[PDB]
Structure 1
Amino acid sequence: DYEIQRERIELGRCIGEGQFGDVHQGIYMSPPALAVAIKTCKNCTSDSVREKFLQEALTMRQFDHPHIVKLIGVITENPVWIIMELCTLGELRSFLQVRKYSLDLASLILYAYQLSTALAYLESKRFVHRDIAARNVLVSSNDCVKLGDLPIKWMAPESINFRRFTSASDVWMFGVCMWEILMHGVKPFQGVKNNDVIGRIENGERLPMPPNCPPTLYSLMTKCWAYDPSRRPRFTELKAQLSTILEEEKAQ
């Protein structure tokens, strides 16, 4: 039973925004004082919105991975809330930007490694994500990131051209996500028009090597960006390669 008694929740300060409403941090008193994230729903007094909001919680129930945010429970009567595991440090993009000059390379590589483990897990569950980007990643601690919950600049050419979405197109998007982390949260193709992104990629052009990114890690990003989806590594191969790049970086 995922239904939580409202009196067990102390609503704290607003910490961010979601599609349905504000996200707040708070406290969950269970049989004691667990820090939680509380997702609110502005229009949940309407059942069409309520069903869509609560469907997200039902989706979360299916996953059990250390690098995917966990659902704690729901409050189905107005105001409708979803109680999630709190990732205290917030959104990854903002975290990377604020810590641009204070996060070492080993930490950046660790975040890419952890995200590849969560994605190889979702691949093993036969779940295609379709929206892999640094914006949907949350920070639990300085050493732990988690997956939370058209973007032409992040999309595989087959997804843009023919709406083909597979684990291989998720790999392309993850290559862009790895570039974003190594770029300290800078978005890809800044100042480039969406309709001119496909052309540049068709021309063989790719996102450049981020400053201070190891060549072995940049090489792994470019394999994610092979035009042919069958030539892209699988998430399991990404995981094994990122583990070796992480160890090499941890050794100096």
Structure 2
Amino acid sequence: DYEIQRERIELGRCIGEGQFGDVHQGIYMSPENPALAVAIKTCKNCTSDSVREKFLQEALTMRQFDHPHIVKLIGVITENPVWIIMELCTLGELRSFLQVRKYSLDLASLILYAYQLSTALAYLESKRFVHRDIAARNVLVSSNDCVKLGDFGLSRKLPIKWMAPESINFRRFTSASDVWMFGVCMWEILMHGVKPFQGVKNNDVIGRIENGERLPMPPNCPPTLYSLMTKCWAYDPSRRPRFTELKAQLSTILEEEKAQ
């Protein structure tokens, strides 16, 4: 079931570049089922068994997950050319989607994306996985009302601007450090896909965080949501909320916005 027959894949257009090679969209002709839209990850140098093992590492990890807000692994093809087949999020990368729609996406949609991501991250935690790379660039858009976490490369250069202090200083990665990163991801969503700490050197960010400085309140962000983000950024990991508490509080914030 993990191994897929290449004859059941129809390769389509290139939709981006990955670490190991181009990614294309295509179709998976599932046995006795409707054809699924898929993302096919290619690997340029996978003729090397050493490169193949590194490329396939992420697919081995994805096989154990099953959640509505996490991209699904369909299968892999281990003969040359080696391919990784994922469920396709039709609308693409969340940052680009937010940047284009800055003056048209309503606030309830932005809060909904944060809520959905909190459910995927509570699920990740429940499986003893620590993501270590929560950022809007790793979120994909399945539809206008559905986002999914799509990159597990660092799961179970360093993204310093998203990292908790204990991860930068001591290489500690826990579900509480993922909560810090999720706070930064929520800020990126509320900022319509703007990167945190733009124009600031990585070492200047470290000194700013240690000194108590934090990302500012996004314009039009509900105060309760910004307070929630600042709690994700408590220096002491014990003072951060848990993903289950984030999910409950995001649901309340979403319903308060929907009731206008």
TM-score range with shorter-chain normalisation? Answer: over 0.9
Task: Give 1:30 shift.
Answer: 2.1
Find the aligned partners of 1:238 and 1:168 in 2 and give their Cα distance: 12
Q: Percent identity?
A: 100
Q: Structure 2: how far apart are the matches of 1:202 and 1:58?
A: 37
Q: Distance in 2 between matches of 1:107 and 1:131?
A: 23
Residue of 50, 53, 63 corresponding to 2:52 = 50
What whole-Å deviation, never above 9, does each CA across 1:73-113 have from its counterpart, x for those lacking one?
11110010011100000111111111111110000000000
1:200, CA displacement in angstroms?
Answer: 1.0
Using the alignment, how far apart are the partners of 1:16 and 1:99 within structure 2?
20
Q: Give the Cα–Cα distance (whole angstroms) in 2 for the partners of residues 138 and 167 of structure 1.
A: 21
How far apart, CA to CA, are the structure 1 residues paired with 2:214 and 2:246?
Answer: 19
Quote the offset at 1:29 in angstroms.
1.3
Deviations 1:95-140 (A, max 9, x none): 1111111110000000000000000001111111111100111100
Aligned equivalents of 1:163, 1:33: Cα separation in 2: 43
Alignment of 1:152-167 (within 5 A): 152-167=160-175
Partner of 1:26: 26
1:158-179 CA distances to partner (integer Å, 9 max, x unpaired)? 1111111111111000000000
The number of residues matched between the two structures is 252
Gaps of 5+ in 1: none
Q: Distance in 1 between matches of 2:30 and 2:181?
A: 39
C-alpha distance in 1 between matches for 2:163 and 2:227: 19
Deviation string, structure 1 residues 130-156 (Cα, Å, up to 9, x no partner): 111001111000000001121111011
Distance (Å, rounded) in 2 between the aligned partners of 1:101 and 1:108: 12
Specify the SS of the correspondent of 2:207.
helix
Query: What secondary structure does 1:186 align onto?
Result: coil
Assess if the C-alpha contact under 8 Å between 2:36 and 2:87 holds in 1: no
Report if the CA contact (8 A) 2:15-2:25 is conserved: yes
How large is the RMSD of aligned CA atoms in angstroms? 0.8
* Separation (CA, whole Å) in 2 of partners of 1:121 and 1:187: 26
> CA–CA distance in 1 between the matches of 2:126 and 2:35?
35
| Aligned pair partner of 1:99 in 98, 101, 105 | 101
SS in 2 for 1:110: helix
> For the residues of structure 2 that align with 1:213 and 1:251, how far apart are their CA atoms?
16
